[PDB]
Design a protein around this motif. Structure first.
Motif, PDB file in Angstrom:
ATOM      1  N   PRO A  30      -7.543  -2.198   5.777  1.00  0.00           N
ATOM      2  CA  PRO A  30      -8.906  -1.552   6.078  1.00  0.00           C
ATOM      3  C   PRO A  30     -10.127  -2.385   6.814  1.00  0.00           C
ATOM      4  N   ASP A  83      -4.868   8.854  -2.653  1.00  0.00           N
ATOM      5  CA  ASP A  83      -6.116   7.943  -2.673  1.00  0.00           C
ATOM      6  C   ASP A  83      -7.376   8.396  -2.332  1.00  0.00           C
ATOM      7  N   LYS A 103      -2.242   4.596   7.274  1.00  0.00           N
ATOM      8  CA  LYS A 103      -2.816   4.387   5.847  1.00  0.00           C
ATOM      9  C   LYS A 103      -2.482   3.096   5.405  1.00  0.00           C
ATOM     10  N   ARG A 131      -0.491   4.848  -1.288  1.00  0.00           N
ATOM     11  CA  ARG A 131      -1.492   5.831  -0.554  1.00  0.00           C
ATOM     12  C   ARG A 131      -0.685   6.668   0.368  1.00  0.00           C
ATOM     13  N   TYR A 164      -8.520  -0.707  -0.416  1.00  0.00           N
ATOM     14  CA  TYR A 164      -8.760   0.569  -0.763  1.00  0.00           C
ATOM     15  C   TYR A 164      -8.889   0.608  -2.321  1.00  0.00           C
ATOM     16  N   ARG A 187       0.845  -1.254   0.090  1.00  0.00           N
ATOM     17  CA  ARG A 187       0.118   0.068  -0.054  1.00  0.00           C
ATOM     18  C   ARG A 187       0.846   1.259   0.111  1.00  0.00           C
ATOM     19  N   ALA A 217      -9.617   6.855   0.212  1.00  0.00           N
ATOM     20  CA  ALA A 217     -10.066   6.296   1.495  1.00  0.00           C
ATOM     21  C   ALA A 217     -11.126   5.562   1.328  1.00  0.00           C
ATOM     22  N   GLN A 218     -11.608   5.108   0.369  1.00  0.00           N
ATOM     23  CA  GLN A 218     -12.872   4.243  -0.183  1.00  0.00           C
ATOM     24  C   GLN A 218     -12.471   2.735  -0.606  1.00  0.00           C
ATOM     25  N   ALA A 219     -13.031   1.746  -0.102  1.00  0.00           N
ATOM     26  CA  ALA A 219     -12.589   0.534  -0.010  1.00  0.00           C
ATOM     27  C   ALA A 219     -13.848  -0.353  -0.585  1.00  0.00           C
TER      28      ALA A 219
END
Ligand SMILES: CCCCCCCCCCCCCCCCCC(=O)OC[C@H](COP(=O)([O-])OCC[N+](C)(C)C)OC(=O)CCCCCCCCCCCCCCCCC
Ligand SMILES: CCCCCCCCCCCCCCCCCC(=O)OC[C@H](COP(=O)([O-])OCC[N+](C)(C)C)OC(=O)CCCCCCCCCCCCCCCCC
Ligand SMILES: Nc1ncnc2c1ncn2[C@@H]1O[C@H](COP(=O)(O)OP(=O)(O)OP(=O)(O)O)[C@@H](O)[C@H]1O
Ligand SMILES: [Mg+2]
Lengths: 75, 160, 256, 119, 58, 75, 75, 75, 75
Positions: C120, C179, C116, C71, C155, C68, C181-183
């Motif tokens: 998630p 990014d 981050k 991000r 994410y 990740r 922040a949605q998944a």
């Protein structure tokens, strides 16, 4: 030396202030012990021990002052 | 998100919903409704200039969605009836800020379930339904009959 | 995808959640079958406890940051904080306040990189409470008979379509985030009592709640769909539709 | 906070004279002007000690507004011998003093490490 | 059994005994009379901490 | 110089002022304990556990003063 | 000059006056807490909470003065 | 000059006197709030609000005193 | 001249004495209100009004002192 010694001994007199407040705290404490004793005499010994016990916390500050007193009186 | 000009008598000292009108406007359609004259709180209850400045900041850092709508629903034709200098200044400043207004329209009904607000254009008599997310309205007044039955008021319902 | 993964075969979706009471790590990874005494190595080599902590705790932690890494590549972490650290680092020998103001932006970057890069985690108990309240699902699924076949939740990269989410076209927000922040993910479920299977697809986004500055729910299901399949019946349940949810609530746009 | 407090404390050390050096030079000569005025109006006994600052209101202010007035009087009251002499004078034993006796306090100050000239 | 307690550092006597009669015999006159909780390990620490609007977590 | 020293010691004497009030505050605290004990002795432990806690905070300030006392005496 | 400094160090000593009243003020708050507890020991939680909160404001003023003390001592 | 200056910083110290009484006044207020609560804990929110309100008025005097201090210290 | 000016500043500090007692008097009044309120909360409005009125009368003396202070400070 002699000049500072004069205020040293004067400060030692200040130690007699807790000696005053300790007396008042005593008169007030035993007053509560007496009135509280009347309301519930069944636990006399309990109250009595806590009374003198509380008093021990009074002379604590007393000796502490005199100790701090003679200390600065010579340190 | 329905707000008003005064606090009801059922709120205790722990309720501060009144202070969340400007803060909690993250998105949606906002409507500031003004009832038909005569009403109480002509200029002392106009908070559409502080909200604009506070909501201008929210659009800067994203707290307020960019697709939002704030319009002033004024049932009357002018904001300040007995002072043309002030009303002309208001309408002049509202346009300078970028606010939209709709005259001759007064709030009629509020649905708490689906957040529907029923407005009506007194000029055309045409009513509409609009989704809302932050609704503020100045409480409307009402003439008391005991002053009209005694023959004291004149017209609108004010003392002669 | 699960970022924290060791060579252990069992419970991949719980490896980062489970806090074991071991003083060290087990000699061998959890066996998938009964083995022979000669399959394993007695008296493992010297410095084995340190080797395990590196390959079971350190390494999978760095694989998470690498998985990740897209991000954390924002202008705030890349240029601003390192530049702020260098400005005060030139005066570090003059006083102590310069050493602090030069290290603070580094500790701040680590904190943002730390939070981050984590997997998630949504409030799964809120989710199961939501599906077990639906009657069309309780007809074929129950907690006492349900089992997980697959799990995916990650994410979404980059900014989204600037018509469905115009919020992210904010240069001030873009300075802090690369990014959204949605998944998005799914859940492959099965019921051993009814023999039914369903794919529980869901999309999440952070939303504000009841307050001015704080986020209410970082993972709010604005789209929740279930494609149920049984012996000879196929059903499609819609617990949360995005067309009706996106008209009521909008994302949060985390800063810092 | 510690970063800012530790920084401004440095700038005020390195820099700072840009805005307060005038007030320091002002208080420097001022501290000498009032001292010079004290020696003019003050009772100095056979030794250089202001023993009567309460002689008048102006003497009280000149004594307080001075820098060395506190020292010349403190170093005199701290010298046990000079106070022994005074105790004798109060009882009725007094006489004339030589130049060496007049500086009995200057010798005491020098022993402590003070920088006194005119012995 | 005594080796298992030692190798797991369960060196608090009577922790894995449902009825620690030896512990009750030793605390018949103890201040704050109590016995060790069942399966208590000398290394476990369940202490929590919270921050509220008031001080000291109140 | 010598004057500020005479003042430094003078301040150190003032530190014995809380030492005085701490004694008085104790007699009052222990008085309430007795009355509170005579009122409902069944709940002694709770009433008691809160007593010493209060007292701990009381003499804590007393020690705190002595800290500032020696500080100004040497700083 | 030197005297103004001598007064500064003295003002620093005066800060130990709230320290004295804080001890007495603390003993009183805990004295009532005992009695208030014996009268209705079922509500230990609420009463105890109010005690420390009140204690906070009390000590808050204590250290406020100490801060004010060092301020005037160097400013 | 310096004499008037000495009194200026001296008064600045005197402002810590209400700070002492404010500490004592706070303990008494909360001690009553505790007793007032144990009597009838049904009015927590009411008694609690009335408490903090009175305390707010106390800080008015406290801040007023300090304000007077710096003012007289420079005027 | 400079001496009387110094005393003028000194008396100006003396005004902080009613400020101290005014703070203590405030806690006392509100404590009586709290306890008196819990005993009979039905008529809070009556007790409440009487409270603030007394607090106003307290500030009356407070403002009187400050007024007296600036007066002798310039007259
Ligand atoms: C210019 C030089 C660069 C600077 C050098 C920096 C050296 C950094 C490495 C030494 C510091 C070690 C401190 C660890 C303290 C905390 C313990 C820990 O690691 O937690 C891990 C934790 C592990 O997770 P956890 O411990 O938080 O929780 C685990 C939970 N359970 C038990 C349930 C699984 O993960 C992380 O903290 C995130 C990864 C951080 C990675 C640390 C730095 C790695 C640096 C890689 C590049 C180095 C290049 C040099 C090599 C060159 C070739 C030789
Ligand atoms: C020489 C070899 C080395 C020896 C090392 C020390 C040996 C220690 C022996 C064990 C006794 C230890 C005393 C613990 C207190 C037991 C009593 C009790 O719990 O109170 C109940 C008491 C007594 O309740 P009770 O009901 O059981 O008894 C009542 C007694 N009569 C009958 C007379 C009325 O009640 C309380 O609730 C008071 C609570 C306060 C207790 C104070 C504890 C302070 C110590 C805790 C901190 C210590 C940690 C140190 C860590 C250091 C780290 C570096
Ligand atoms: N009510 C709580 N009270 C005290 N601490 C809590 C509480 N809830 C969580 N914590 C702590 O915060 C941690 C994370 O909480 P969280 O709800 O995200 O865990 P979770 O396993 O993801 O739950 P779920 O399975 O429903 O998604 C927890 O491990 C716990 O240490
Ligand atoms: Mg979770």
């Amino acid at each position: 030396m002699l000049l500072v010694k004069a205020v040293k001994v004067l400060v030692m007199g200040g130690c007699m202030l807790p000696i005053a407040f300790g007396a008042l705290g005593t008169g007030v404490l035993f007053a509560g012990f007496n009135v509280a004793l009347s309301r519930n005499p069944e636990e006399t010994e309990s109250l009595f021990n806590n009374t003198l016990m509380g008093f021990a916390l009074i002379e604590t500050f007393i000796f502490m002052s005199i100790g701090l007193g003679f200390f600065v009186l010579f340190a | 998100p329905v707000y008003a000009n005064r606090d009801p008598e059922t709120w205790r000292s722990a309720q501060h919903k009144y202070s969340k009108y400007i803060s909690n406007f993250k998105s949606g359609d906002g409507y500031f409704c003004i009832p038909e004259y005569p009403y109480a709180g002509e200029v002392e209850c106009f908070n559409f200039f502080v909200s604009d400045e506070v909501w201008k900041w929210a659009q800067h850092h994203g707290a307020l969605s960019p697709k939002h709508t704030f319009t002033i629903v004024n049932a009357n034709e002018k904001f300040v009836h007995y002072c043309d200098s002030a009303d002309a200044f208001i309408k002049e400043r509202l346009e300078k800020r970028g606010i939209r207004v709709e005259y001759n329209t007064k709030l009629l009904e509020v649905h708490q379930d689906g957040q529907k607000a029923t407005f009506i254009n007194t000029k055309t008599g045409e009513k509409s339904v609009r989704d809302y997310n932050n609704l503020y309205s100045i409480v409307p007044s009402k003439r008391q009959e005991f002053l009209d039955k005694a023959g004291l008021t004149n017209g609108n319902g004010l003392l002669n | 995808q699960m970022g924290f993964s060791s060579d252990n075969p069992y419970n991949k979706r719980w490896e980062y959640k489970w806090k074991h009471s071991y003083y060290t790590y087990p000699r061998d990874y959890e066996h998938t079958e009964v083995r022979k005494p000669q399959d394993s190595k007695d008296v493992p080599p010297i410095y084995f406890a340190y080797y395990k902590d590196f390959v079971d705790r350190w390494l999978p932690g760095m694989n998470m940051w690498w998985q990740r890494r897209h991000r954390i590549f924002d202008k705030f972490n890349v240029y601003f904080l390192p530049g702020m650290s260098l400005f005060f680092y030139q005066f570090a020998d003059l006083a102590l306040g310069f050493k602090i103001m030069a290290a603070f932006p580094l500790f701040l970057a680590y904190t943002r990189i730390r939070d981050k890069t984590l997997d998630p985690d949504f409030k799964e108990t809120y989710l199961r409470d939501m599906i077990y309240q639906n009657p069309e699902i309780t007809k074929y699924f129950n907690e006492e008979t349900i089992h997980v076949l697959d799990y995916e939740f990650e994410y979404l990269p980059g900014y989204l379509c600037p018509e469905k989410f115009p919020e992210y076209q904010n240069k001030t927000w873009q300075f802090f985030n690369t990014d959204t922040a949605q998944a998005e993910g799914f859940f492959k479920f099965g019921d051993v009592e009814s023999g039914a299977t369903m794919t529980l697809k869901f999309k999440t986004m952070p939303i504000p709640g009841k307050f001015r500055y704080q986020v209410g729910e970082p993972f709010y299901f604005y789209d929740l769909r279930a494609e149920i399949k049984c012996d000879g019946v196929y059903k499609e349940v819609v617990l949360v539709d995005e067309k009706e949810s996106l008209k009521k609530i909008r994302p949060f746009l985390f800063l810092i | 906070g510690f970063g800012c407090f530790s920084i401004i404390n440095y700038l005020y050390g390195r820099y700072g004279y840009i805005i307060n050096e005038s007030s320091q030079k002002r208080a420097a000569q001022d501290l000498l002007d009032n001292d010079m005025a004290a020696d003019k109006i003050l009772f100095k006994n056979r030794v250089g000690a202001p023993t009567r600052p309460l002689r008048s209101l102006d003497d009280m202010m000149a004594f307080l507004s001075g820098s060395a007035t506190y020292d010349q009087l403190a170093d005199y009251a701290s010298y046990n011998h000079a106070m022994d002499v005074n105790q004798d004078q109060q009882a009725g034993l007094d006489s004339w003093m030589s130049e060496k006796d007049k500086n009995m306090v200057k010798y005491y100050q020098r022993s402590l490490g003070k920088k006194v000239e005119g012995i | 059994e005594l080796e298992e307690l030692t190798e797991t550092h369960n060196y608090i006597p009577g922790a894995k005994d449902d009825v620690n009669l030896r512990g009750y015999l030793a605390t018949q006159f103890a201040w704050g009379k109590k016995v060790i909780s069942f399966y208590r390990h000398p290394a476990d620490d369940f202490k929590c901490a919270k921050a509220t609007k008031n001080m000291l977590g109140r």
